[PDB]
DNA sequence: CAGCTCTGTACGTGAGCGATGGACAGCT
DNA sequence: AGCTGTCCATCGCTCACGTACAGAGCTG
């Protein structure tokens, strides 16, 4: 067993709650919660996931944080959390086309409410669907980083990063993703100097 | 033909897991 | 000196909130 006696079937019935507030700077949008997040009730508890490590190596967090700290982030730092698909999935390749499109609609309504300065898509696959469904734009070479469109009727920017999951071989280490988190830290700073 | 879409497949790290064995202490 | 167990170091192994790209099958 990997979940201390809790069956994987029980975990798929559990959900992970969003941590959203008004006047946030950053909203971290994951694909869908995984088995460990459903179990813990916290964001990115995967012992090999790069999220908390990249958030420190980049300087967004001044100390080395963990999943139990996610609830302190909206007030201490200005970071929020939400997901494209709400349902617990053991992987991104288990989700269906309809599910993501249902999620894209429910996600855009959330962003139009809370209105963060930057919406961070923790995964490229979810921006592919979102761009097509919300902006009617399907481009050949989709890239990471700052995107050209703002969330409809808001001033929220769209930032895309490789998934913090250790699954992708194209960015094998946390060190290989850290660059996007630093460039995100710069965008937050550039925007915070509005005056 | 040229450009598009949908789908199948391969790819690097490092963390946790269960199996295994060598060190070492306690007892004859 | 012989025997027996526990502790822990370590091996082999799988897996993680994906990504990119080749190719078949469309379509203009």
Total H helices, total E strands in chain A = 7, 5
Rounded, the Å distance between the CA of A191 and C1' of B10 is 40
For residue A8, how many other CB atoms are within 10 A of its CB?
14
Rg (CA), chain A: 16
Show which positions of strand B are touched by protein (CB under 7 A): 4-5, 7, 9, 11-18
Beta-carbon contacts of A185 under 8 Å, excluding residues fewer than 6 positions away, are A58, A59, A60
Q: Is the CB of A75 under 7 A from strand C?
A: no
- Of A residues 55-94, those with CB within 7 angstroms of nucleic strand B are 93
Rounded, the Å distance between the CA of A33 and C1' of C26 is 35
For the domain spanning A1-195, the CATH number is 3.40.470.10
Cα gap A53→A56, rounded to integer Å:
5
Q: Which of A50, A28, A59, A54 is nearest to A185 (CA)?
A: A59
Q: Which of A106, A104, A116 is nearest to A156 (CA)?
A: A116
Cα gap A150→A195, rounded to integer Å:
21
Tell me the three state secondary structure of residue A160.
strand
Cα gap A37→A101, rounded to integer Å:
22
């Amino acid at each position: 067993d990997r979940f201390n006696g809790v069956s994987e079937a029980e975990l798929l019935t559990k959900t992970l709650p969003d941590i959203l507030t008004f006047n946030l700077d950053i909203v971290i949008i994951g694909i869908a919660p995984g088995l460990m997040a459903a179990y813990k009730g916290h964001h990115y508890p995967g012992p090999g996931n790069h999220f908390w490590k990249c958030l420190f190596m980049s300087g967004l967090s001044e100390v080395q944080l963990n999943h139990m700290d996610d609830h302190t982030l909206p007030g201490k730092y200005g970071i929020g959390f939400t997901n494209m698909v709400e349902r617990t999935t053991p992987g991104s390749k288990d989700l269906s086309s309809k599910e993501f499109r249902e999620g894209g609609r429910i996600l855009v309504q959330k962003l139009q409410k809370y209105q963060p300065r930057i919406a961070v898509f923790n995964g490229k696959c979810i921006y592919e669907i979102f761009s097509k469904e919300v902006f009617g734009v399907k481009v050949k070479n989709l890239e990471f980083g700052l995107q050209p469109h703002k969330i409809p009727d808001t001033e929220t920017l769209c930032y895309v990063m490789p998934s913090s999951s250790a699954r992708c071989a194209q960015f094998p280490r946390a060190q290989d993703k850290v660059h996007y988190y630093i460039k995100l830290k710069d965008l937050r700073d550039q925007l915070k100097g509005i005056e």
